[PDB]
Amino acid sequence: ETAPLRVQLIAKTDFLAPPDVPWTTDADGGPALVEFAGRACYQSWSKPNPKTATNAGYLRHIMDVGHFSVLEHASVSFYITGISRSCTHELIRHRHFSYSQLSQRYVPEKDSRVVVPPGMEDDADLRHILTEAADAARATYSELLAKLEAKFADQPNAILRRKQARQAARAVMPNATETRIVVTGNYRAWRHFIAMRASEHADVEIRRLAIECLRQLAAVAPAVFADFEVTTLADGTEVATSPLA
Amino acid sequence: ETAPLRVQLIAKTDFLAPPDVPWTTDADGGPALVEFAGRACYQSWSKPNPKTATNAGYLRHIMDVGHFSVLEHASVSFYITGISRSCTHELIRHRHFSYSQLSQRYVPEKDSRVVVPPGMEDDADLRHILTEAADAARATYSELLAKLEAKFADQPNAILRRKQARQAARAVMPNATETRIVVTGNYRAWRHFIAMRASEHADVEIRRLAIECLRQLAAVAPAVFADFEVTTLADGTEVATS
Amino acid sequence: ETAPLRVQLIAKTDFLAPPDVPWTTDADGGPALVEFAGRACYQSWSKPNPKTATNAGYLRHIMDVGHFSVLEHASVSFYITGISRSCTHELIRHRHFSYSQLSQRYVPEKDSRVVVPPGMEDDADLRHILTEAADAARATYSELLAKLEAKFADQPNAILRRKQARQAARAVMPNATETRIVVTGNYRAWRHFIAMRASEHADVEIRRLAIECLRQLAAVAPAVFADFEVTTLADGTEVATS
Amino acid sequence: ETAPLRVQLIAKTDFLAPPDVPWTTDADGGPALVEFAGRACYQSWSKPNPKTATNAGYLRHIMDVGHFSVLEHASVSFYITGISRSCTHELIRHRHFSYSQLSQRYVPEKDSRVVVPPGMEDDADLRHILTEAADAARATYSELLAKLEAKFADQPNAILRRKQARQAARAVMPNATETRIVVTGNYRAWRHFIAMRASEHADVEIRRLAIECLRQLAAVAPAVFADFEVTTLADGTEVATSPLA
Ligand SMILES: Cc1cc2nc3c(=O)[nH]c(=O)nc-3n(C[C@H](O)[C@H](O)[C@H](O)COP(=O)(O)OP(=O)(O)OC[C@H]3O[C@@H](n4cnc5c(N)ncnc54)[C@H](O)[C@@H]3O)c2cc1C
Ligand SMILES: Cc1cc2nc3c(=O)[nH]c(=O)nc-3n(C[C@H](O)[C@H](O)[C@H](O)COP(=O)(O)OP(=O)(O)OC[C@H]3O[C@@H](n4cnc5c(N)ncnc54)[C@H](O)[C@@H]3O)c2cc1C
Ligand SMILES: Cc1cc2nc3c(=O)[nH]c(=O)nc-3n(C[C@H](O)[C@H](O)[C@H](O)COP(=O)(O)OP(=O)(O)OC[C@H]3O[C@@H](n4cnc5c(N)ncnc54)[C@H](O)[C@@H]3O)c2cc1C
Ligand SMILES: Cc1cc2nc3c(=O)[nH]c(=O)nc-3n(C[C@H](O)[C@H](O)[C@H](O)COP(=O)(O)OP(=O)(O)OC[C@H]3O[C@@H](n4cnc5c(N)ncnc54)[C@H](O)[C@@H]3O)c2cc1C
Ligand SMILES: O=c1[nH]c(=O)n([C@H]2C[C@H](O)[C@@H](COP(=O)(O)O)O2)cc1Br
Ligand SMILES: O=c1[nH]c(=O)n([C@H]2C[C@H](O)[C@@H](COP(=O)(O)O)O2)cc1Br
Ligand SMILES: O=c1[nH]c(=O)n([C@H]2C[C@H](O)[C@@H](COP(=O)(O)O)O2)cc1Br
Ligand SMILES: O=c1[nH]c(=O)n([C@H]2C[C@H](O)[C@@H](COP(=O)(O)O)O2)cc1Br
């Protein structure tokens, strides 16, 4: 059973301007918050320059002059499924994010799906070799678990003795095992992730993930991510580049 | 002129549950996001127990059990004014917040306000010594500025000439000079900030700040901040403990 | 082929007291640096108190009064082998360390070792089920790799060709696969790691790593890591608590 | 009275190669640790490439391909004196350092020194204005301190009484007041600080600090800091620029 990548946006920033500040803007939520924060450094609430007189204009300028720390005020959360364990192992190396991830120490592996590496996707023979190997691993897991459950029956706590058995049984589960994860980060963190992972140096799985995150981030905060350009490589995979990263 | 502490909540989490996840809860925003993230770890979406089906009950349990990392998903931002420079010098030592602060390099301080230390708030004579000293500093600052702008006549760029002068002139501005700051943190970082700063060991200025943030945070997310109990000290200042 | 846990201490803080500061202590390296930094807050260079007039006494005082940020100045690095991929996936959730880890994308995984879960180390039957499962996975790996290199045959860069094949082939490699990692952290990060992972709540594999790290750290900085008491549980695994 | 900038290197990395790894290098300390960490990723313990078979060649390569995360393993600590309170307020915005700083709540300041802004150092008239204002501020501080100690007489704990008094009295102390601070960071953090602070956009005081840190860092680890070129500006201050990050 194979699992496709799904990225669901589950949280963003709600903004409410302070009533006493003599400033309004062209925008809502995160992008308005970022402008407000930038202007707070200068206490410059008026709008002399027509170019930076819209929210998008202001943000593009903030970006251009390298005031990136202002972007940290707004955050976005995704719920991600159809991502492999090897992919999450790379993702969580990014330390300016917060994560909550499906636990193999706790969750049943009996119905677990696998994620096909993008370089194999179009090849039914390779996919077959993968899913068969995954079926073999799952049978092994159930084998180990049954025996381990009996070994750790001594222990009164239901939650402990279930962890002890599954945590050892998990040893046979492959890299391609599906996982699920809530990832939260601010705009500055999201931008770094995209610059690092939406590139030809990156594994094609996390690259695909980064591109999908960028597309969804651009939908909620266009002005913040507009400097990123998506291009398609010879193999048809997608990369994103920005002059500011 | 003096400036009182003002704390204004300007941003918080907006949550939309994923349509295809078979789960609901009796909350929205940050508290609902926290519960979703917690349950994602176990895929424990079904809620058969109607006596543990509440968001508040789940959030309390998350913290009884000590899974504090789940709290990081939700954030709140404040715009804080009427805070002194010595106070922000303490505040910014907290490395899990994001900040945007009023710049003395960029902002003229000829009209700047003073923040009165809570310890001298009820002594008019002491406040007078402070405001007189502030006025003298501001005069010195204006004297230095004019003399620096001339010393920097060599600079053809008028914006840069004014920044070079201002950043040097700022040297005489006192600790009690008002500043203004946007502070953003997730629930975990706010909790830690409150624990450290709303305590008898902390300076009264930042303690006042922490108690006020707490009061607003507790209204926004009761279950997350309910464990903190405010206590009034012998001297009338407030502390908070969990 | 199985791999035992090995933790090797490969780096630590070298301290040189600045000459024109009227202060000395009965210690070296990391512990000495921590006292220097704590004393710099107070400029308390002379030692009026005979109790904290020793380095060990000064550090125990720092801890009791809760001044844990001073511990961040000193650091230690380990090279860890005989750790599984599922163990590293847990370890790297600690965001206040720095890591350099063996790459499956970059390193040919021919003759990879497997780490046996401590829970089945005494069970020869369970070990065998594991090791032949691992053997089957490596066989599948070689089969995919060969087909993948054939598939990407067009790709002109041969290095990039092997990498594209290897990153996809790695898909069948089990959690138990051995990995190797350099981990660097300051004393405060190390203490937090030990507290969270040398506990009954934690997986037994990371718990074992945390205990061994603790033993080596306590040998390097006794005063910093002394409060941790190691006790053997019912099943004969160790936990450490302070 | 006035305090000159002083930067003292007080800690760095001690390295010992694990005996059972088949690798040696010609370097010691931080730079050797960085090579070890980089080789661990590839388990490339042998040395086939005369271009990367030395520590300097290896680090040259690490720097060119930009895997700066391996630089995080080595650290350096300085004790910095003759820095102003406005300079530390900028410095501590860098969140990947660790700090221990002289406390005004805790340490008496009746006799504290003043730091002259670089843009003012050459001018006797401006220096006099500054020192005169500092003398006035210290007199006010003393005046406030005594009255506050008297106002807080109903605190039986004299230590607390002096602190309660001092923390309020410090209200009048100017930005130019000298402070002292231990700063610890890894190589990657120091590179970022230098890049951000030893620049034309930065305040002259912190730029002077960054340059001195850079000078000491590049003497200790020349391969790590070689890309930073020191340039004298027209006003006689120095900046540092690099093609890298
Ligand atoms: C193609 C590629 C190949 C890779 N190969 C390997 C490999 O072989 N082995 C391996 O172990 N990893 C490898 N990685 C992981 C990589 O080295 C980083 O650890 C990971 O990508 C996180 O990115 P980041 O380093 O920018 O840190 P993040 O955690 O994403 O932090 C963001 C930024 O914050 C700063 N920062 C965060 N923490 C610190 C700190 N403690 N000190 C100083 N500054 C800090 C840095 O500026 C950093 O850029 C690879 C990554 C890529 C994309
Ligand atoms: C027994 C146990 C069970 C676990 N179960 C799960 C699970 O089911 N699912 C899952 O995804 N993870 C799980 N984890 C991982 C856990 O939630 C943490 O992510 C991990 O242990 C890292 O430790 P830490 O949260 O204390 O933070 P670290 O990353 O080690 O940071 C140390 C300290 O820095 C501070 N800090 C760091 N980053 C932030 C931040 N951005 N905001 C505010 N403060 C910050 C906090 O004070 C923190 O305590 C589990 C861990 C344990 C030990
Ligand atoms: C010339 C100049 C002008 C400035 N003007 C102002 C101003 O007017 N107002 C003001 O408030 N500040 C101002 N600053 C401060 C500036 O915004 C930064 O806060 C400070 O320089 C720290 O640098 P850093 O942002 O790169 O963060 P560092 O703390 O130095 O972090 C290093 C890297 O880690 C990563 N990182 C750290 N924390 C996070 C996070 N929480 N989320 C995502 N990534 C993270 C980023 O990649 C960052 O580059 C100014 C600084 C300079 C040099
Ligand atoms: C009453 C009191 C007195 C103080 N006195 C002094 C003083 O005299 N001199 C002085 O310099 N400072 C002093 N401070 C500042 C204090 O040391 C901290 O720097 C500040 O309170 C920030 O809090 P924090 O250390 O918990 O770190 P935060 O930056 O708030 O981080 C939150 C958590 O993240 C983790 N974390 C963040 N960064 C790291 C890191 N690099 N390594 C490991 N873990 C990390 C820690 O778990 C920490 O608890 C004082 C603070 C208080 C409240
Ligand atoms: O592109 C990469 N991304 C990444 O995050 N790593 C980190 C993740 C993991 O902690 C370790 C080994 O990763 P791979 O097995 O995916 O190569 O290095 C390595 C490479 Br190459
Ligand atoms: O209660 C405190 N809070 C705090 O943040 N510091 C930090 C802030 C600054 O970096 C340095 C000196 O602070 P004070 O001048 O406010 O003591 O230590 C110190 C004390 Br005591
Ligand atoms: O004890 C734990 N330690 C841990 O680090 N995690 C993190 C690591 C990974 O990101 C995710 C899933 O971990 P397990 O598969 O090991 O449960 O949660 C979870 C548990 Br439970
Ligand atoms: O060059 C700068 N460096 C800096 O760190 N800040 C931060 C420091 C402080 O938190 C706030 C105001 O700093 P200045 O008063 O030094 O501008 O912004 C601002 C500027 Br401009």
PDB file of C-alpha atoms in Angstrom, chain C residues 47-195:
ATOM      1  CA  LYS C  47      37.365  34.515  46.993  1.00  0.00           C
ATOM      2  CA  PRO C  48      35.933  35.765  50.343  1.00  0.00           C
ATOM      3  CA  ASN C  49      33.746  32.681  50.857  1.00  0.00           C
ATOM      4  CA  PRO C  50      35.824  29.575  51.736  1.00  0.00           C
ATOM      5  CA  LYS C  51      32.965  27.339  50.489  1.00  0.00           C
ATOM      6  CA  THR C  52      32.838  28.509  46.862  1.00  0.00           C
ATOM      7  CA  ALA C  53      36.555  29.316  46.973  1.00  0.00           C
ATOM      8  CA  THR C  54      36.996  25.974  45.196  1.00  0.00           C
ATOM      9  CA  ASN C  55      35.868  25.395  41.618  1.00  0.00           C
ATOM     10  CA  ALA C  56      33.725  22.383  42.568  1.00  0.00           C
ATOM     11  CA  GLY C  57      32.061  24.422  45.302  1.00  0.00           C
ATOM     12  CA  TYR C  58      31.462  27.364  42.963  1.00  0.00           C
ATOM     13  CA  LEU C  59      29.793  25.133  40.325  1.00  0.00           C
ATOM     14  CA  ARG C  60      27.517  23.418  42.877  1.00  0.00           C
ATOM     15  CA  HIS C  61      26.444  26.890  43.966  1.00  0.00           C
ATOM     16  CA  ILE C  62      25.690  27.994  40.373  1.00  0.00           C
ATOM     17  CA  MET C  63      23.370  24.977  39.991  1.00  0.00           C
ATOM     18  CA  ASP C  64      21.517  25.369  43.326  1.00  0.00           C
ATOM     19  CA  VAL C  65      20.687  29.009  42.648  1.00  0.00           C
ATOM     20  CA  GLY C  66      19.556  28.059  39.123  1.00  0.00           C
ATOM     21  CA  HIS C  67      22.114  29.960  37.034  1.00  0.00           C
ATOM     22  CA  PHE C  68      22.152  27.365  34.260  1.00  0.00           C
ATOM     23  CA  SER C  69      23.005  29.742  31.396  1.00  0.00           C
ATOM     24  CA  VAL C  70      26.643  29.956  32.630  1.00  0.00           C
ATOM     25  CA  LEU C  71      27.048  26.249  31.776  1.00  0.00           C
ATOM     26  CA  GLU C  72      26.646  27.060  28.067  1.00  0.00           C
ATOM     27  CA  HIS C  73      30.193  28.351  27.744  1.00  0.00           C
ATOM     28  CA  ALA C  74      31.800  24.862  27.948  1.00  0.00           C
ATOM     29  CA  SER C  75      31.295  22.111  25.393  1.00  0.00           C
ATOM     30  CA  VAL C  76      32.073  18.500  24.625  1.00  0.00           C
ATOM     31  CA  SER C  77      31.988  16.492  21.367  1.00  0.00           C
ATOM     32  CA  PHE C  78      31.533  12.709  21.002  1.00  0.00           C
ATOM     33  CA  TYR C  79      31.869  10.385  18.022  1.00  0.00           C
ATOM     34  CA  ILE C  80      29.131   7.755  18.418  1.00  0.00           C
ATOM     35  CA  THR C  81      29.001   4.471  16.497  1.00  0.00           C
ATOM     36  CA  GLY C  82      26.768   1.402  16.938  1.00  0.00           C
ATOM     37  CA  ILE C  83      23.677   3.593  17.071  1.00  0.00           C
ATOM     38  CA  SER C  84      20.693   2.775  14.874  1.00  0.00           C
ATOM     39  CA  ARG C  85      18.923   5.022  12.383  1.00  0.00           C
ATOM     40  CA  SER C  86      15.794   5.079  14.604  1.00  0.00           C
ATOM     41  CA  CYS C  87      17.964   6.177  17.518  1.00  0.00           C
ATOM     42  CA  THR C  88      19.445   9.106  15.506  1.00  0.00           C
ATOM     43  CA  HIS C  89      15.963  10.120  14.363  1.00  0.00           C
ATOM     44  CA  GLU C  90      15.214  10.583  18.064  1.00  0.00           C
ATOM     45  CA  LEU C  91      18.574  12.121  19.024  1.00  0.00           C
ATOM     46  CA  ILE C  92      18.457  14.895  16.398  1.00  0.00           C
ATOM     47  CA  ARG C  93      15.157  16.169  17.796  1.00  0.00           C
ATOM     48  CA  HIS C  94      17.410  17.924  20.312  1.00  0.00           C
ATOM     49  CA  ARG C  95      17.868  21.275  18.614  1.00  0.00           C
ATOM     50  CA  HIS C  96      20.629  22.639  20.837  1.00  0.00           C
ATOM     51  CA  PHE C  97      23.305  20.276  19.596  1.00  0.00           C
ATOM     52  CA  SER C  98      25.319  20.300  16.368  1.00  0.00           C
ATOM     53  CA  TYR C  99      25.553  17.089  14.323  1.00  0.00           C
ATOM     54  CA  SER C 100      27.599  15.594  11.552  1.00  0.00           C
ATOM     55  CA  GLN C 101      26.223  12.263  10.444  1.00  0.00           C
ATOM     56  CA  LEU C 102      27.020   9.393   8.078  1.00  0.00           C
ATOM     57  CA  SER C 103      25.042   9.895   4.872  1.00  0.00           C
ATOM     58  CA  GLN C 104      23.162   7.020   3.172  1.00  0.00           C
ATOM     59  CA  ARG C 105      22.799   9.315   0.103  1.00  0.00           C
ATOM     60  CA  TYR C 106      26.591   9.580  -0.162  1.00  0.00           C
ATOM     61  CA  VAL C 107      28.017   6.345   1.303  1.00  0.00           C
ATOM     62  CA  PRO C 108      27.725   2.928  -0.454  1.00  0.00           C
ATOM     63  CA  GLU C 109      25.753   0.772   2.019  1.00  0.00           C
ATOM     64  CA  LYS C 110      27.534  -2.484   1.140  1.00  0.00           C
ATOM     65  CA  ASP C 111      28.219  -4.534   4.292  1.00  0.00           C
ATOM     66  CA  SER C 112      26.152  -2.304   6.586  1.00  0.00           C
ATOM     67  CA  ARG C 113      25.957  -3.380  10.205  1.00  0.00           C
ATOM     68  CA  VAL C 114      22.750  -3.626  12.257  1.00  0.00           C
ATOM     69  CA  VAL C 115      22.178  -2.520  15.843  1.00  0.00           C
ATOM     70  CA  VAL C 116      20.228  -5.000  18.002  1.00  0.00           C
ATOM     71  CA  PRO C 117      17.457  -3.384  20.088  1.00  0.00           C
ATOM     72  CA  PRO C 118      18.564  -3.734  23.747  1.00  0.00           C
ATOM     73  CA  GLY C 119      15.157  -5.310  24.492  1.00  0.00           C
ATOM     74  CA  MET C 120      16.083  -8.373  22.407  1.00  0.00           C
ATOM     75  CA  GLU C 121      19.848  -8.557  23.071  1.00  0.00           C
ATOM     76  CA  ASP C 122      19.479 -11.600  25.367  1.00  0.00           C
ATOM     77  CA  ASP C 123      17.094 -13.442  23.039  1.00  0.00           C
ATOM     78  CA  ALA C 124      18.988 -15.481  20.446  1.00  0.00           C
ATOM     79  CA  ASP C 125      15.734 -16.344  18.619  1.00  0.00           C
ATOM     80  CA  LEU C 126      14.673 -12.692  18.331  1.00  0.00           C
ATOM     81  CA  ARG C 127      18.205 -11.717  17.249  1.00  0.00           C
ATOM     82  CA  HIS C 128      18.104 -14.307  14.432  1.00  0.00           C
ATOM     83  CA  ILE C 129      14.715 -13.107  13.141  1.00  0.00           C
ATOM     84  CA  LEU C 130      16.198  -9.603  13.044  1.00  0.00           C
ATOM     85  CA  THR C 131      19.523 -10.460  11.370  1.00  0.00           C
ATOM     86  CA  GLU C 132      18.038 -12.432   8.491  1.00  0.00           C
ATOM     87  CA  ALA C 133      15.406  -9.732   7.948  1.00  0.00           C
ATOM     88  CA  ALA C 134      18.350  -7.301   7.692  1.00  0.00           C
ATOM     89  CA  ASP C 135      20.080  -9.732   5.310  1.00  0.00           C
ATOM     90  CA  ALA C 136      16.959  -9.855   3.049  1.00  0.00           C
ATOM     91  CA  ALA C 137      16.753  -6.039   2.979  1.00  0.00           C
ATOM     92  CA  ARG C 138      20.420  -5.694   1.877  1.00  0.00           C
ATOM     93  CA  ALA C 139      19.752  -8.249  -0.860  1.00  0.00           C
ATOM     94  CA  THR C 140      16.753  -6.160  -2.011  1.00  0.00           C
ATOM     95  CA  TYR C 141      18.967  -3.038  -1.815  1.00  0.00           C
ATOM     96  CA  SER C 142      21.600  -4.489  -4.178  1.00  0.00           C
ATOM     97  CA  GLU C 143      18.839  -5.541  -6.581  1.00  0.00           C
ATOM     98  CA  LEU C 144      17.301  -2.047  -6.711  1.00  0.00           C
ATOM     99  CA  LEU C 145      20.666  -0.295  -6.908  1.00  0.00           C
ATOM    100  CA  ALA C 146      21.683  -2.248 -10.018  1.00  0.00           C
ATOM    101  CA  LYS C 147      18.347  -1.564 -11.700  1.00  0.00           C
ATOM    102  CA  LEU C 148      18.393   2.089 -10.650  1.00  0.00           C
ATOM    103  CA  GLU C 149      21.915   2.667 -12.041  1.00  0.00           C
ATOM    104  CA  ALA C 150      20.681   1.038 -15.259  1.00  0.00           C
ATOM    105  CA  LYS C 151      17.569   3.278 -15.204  1.00  0.00           C
ATOM    106  CA  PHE C 152      19.550   6.510 -14.783  1.00  0.00           C
ATOM    107  CA  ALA C 153      22.093   5.309 -17.399  1.00  0.00           C
ATOM    108  CA  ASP C 154      21.425   8.469 -19.451  1.00  0.00           C
ATOM    109  CA  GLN C 155      22.729  10.828 -16.693  1.00  0.00           C
ATOM    110  CA  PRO C 156      26.203  12.030 -17.927  1.00  0.00           C
ATOM    111  CA  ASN C 157      27.622  12.694 -14.437  1.00  0.00           C
ATOM    112  CA  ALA C 158      28.548   9.259 -13.033  1.00  0.00           C
ATOM    113  CA  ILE C 159      28.930  10.504  -9.430  1.00  0.00           C
ATOM    114  CA  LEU C 160      25.435  12.038  -9.580  1.00  0.00           C
ATOM    115  CA  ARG C 161      24.200   8.823 -11.239  1.00  0.00           C
ATOM    116  CA  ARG C 162      25.323   6.616  -8.316  1.00  0.00           C
ATOM    117  CA  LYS C 163      23.855   9.146  -5.862  1.00  0.00           C
ATOM    118  CA  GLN C 164      20.429   9.184  -7.559  1.00  0.00           C
ATOM    119  CA  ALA C 165      20.472   5.368  -7.479  1.00  0.00           C
ATOM    120  CA  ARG C 166      21.720   5.151  -3.885  1.00  0.00           C
ATOM    121  CA  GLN C 167      19.178   7.649  -2.462  1.00  0.00           C
ATOM    122  CA  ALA C 168      16.298   5.701  -3.983  1.00  0.00           C
ATOM    123  CA  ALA C 169      17.772   2.227  -3.102  1.00  0.00           C
ATOM    124  CA  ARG C 170      18.160   3.232   0.606  1.00  0.00           C
ATOM    125  CA  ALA C 171      14.337   3.010   0.706  1.00  0.00           C
ATOM    126  CA  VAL C 172      14.517  -0.652   1.853  1.00  0.00           C
ATOM    127  CA  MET C 173      17.122  -0.183   4.575  1.00  0.00           C
ATOM    128  CA  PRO C 174      15.707  -0.945   8.058  1.00  0.00           C
ATOM    129  CA  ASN C 175      15.558   1.284  11.130  1.00  0.00           C
ATOM    130  CA  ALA C 176      18.132  -1.016  12.766  1.00  0.00           C
ATOM    131  CA  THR C 177      20.793  -0.054  10.177  1.00  0.00           C
ATOM    132  CA  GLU C 178      23.922   1.284  11.887  1.00  0.00           C
ATOM    133  CA  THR C 179      24.827   4.936  11.540  1.00  0.00           C
ATOM    134  CA  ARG C 180      27.682   7.073  12.902  1.00  0.00           C
ATOM    135  CA  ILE C 181      27.465  10.591  14.276  1.00  0.00           C
ATOM    136  CA  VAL C 182      29.506  13.434  15.734  1.00  0.00           C
ATOM    137  CA  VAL C 183      27.447  15.233  18.454  1.00  0.00           C
ATOM    138  CA  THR C 184      28.534  18.539  20.003  1.00  0.00           C
ATOM    139  CA  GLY C 185      26.761  20.336  22.822  1.00  0.00           C
ATOM    140  CA  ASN C 186      27.456  22.624  25.735  1.00  0.00           C
ATOM    141  CA  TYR C 187      27.055  21.484  29.361  1.00  0.00           C
ATOM    142  CA  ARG C 188      23.525  22.863  29.607  1.00  0.00           C
ATOM    143  CA  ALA C 189      22.407  21.029  26.457  1.00  0.00           C
ATOM    144  CA  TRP C 190      24.073  17.790  27.687  1.00  0.00           C
ATOM    145  CA  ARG C 191      22.260  18.008  31.076  1.00  0.00           C
ATOM    146  CA  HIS C 192      18.895  18.486  29.359  1.00  0.00           C
ATOM    147  CA  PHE C 193      19.585  15.517  27.054  1.00  0.00           C
ATOM    148  CA  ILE C 194      20.497  13.236  30.002  1.00  0.00           C
ATOM    149  CA  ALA C 195      17.416  14.373  31.981  1.00  0.00           C
TER     150      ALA C 195
END
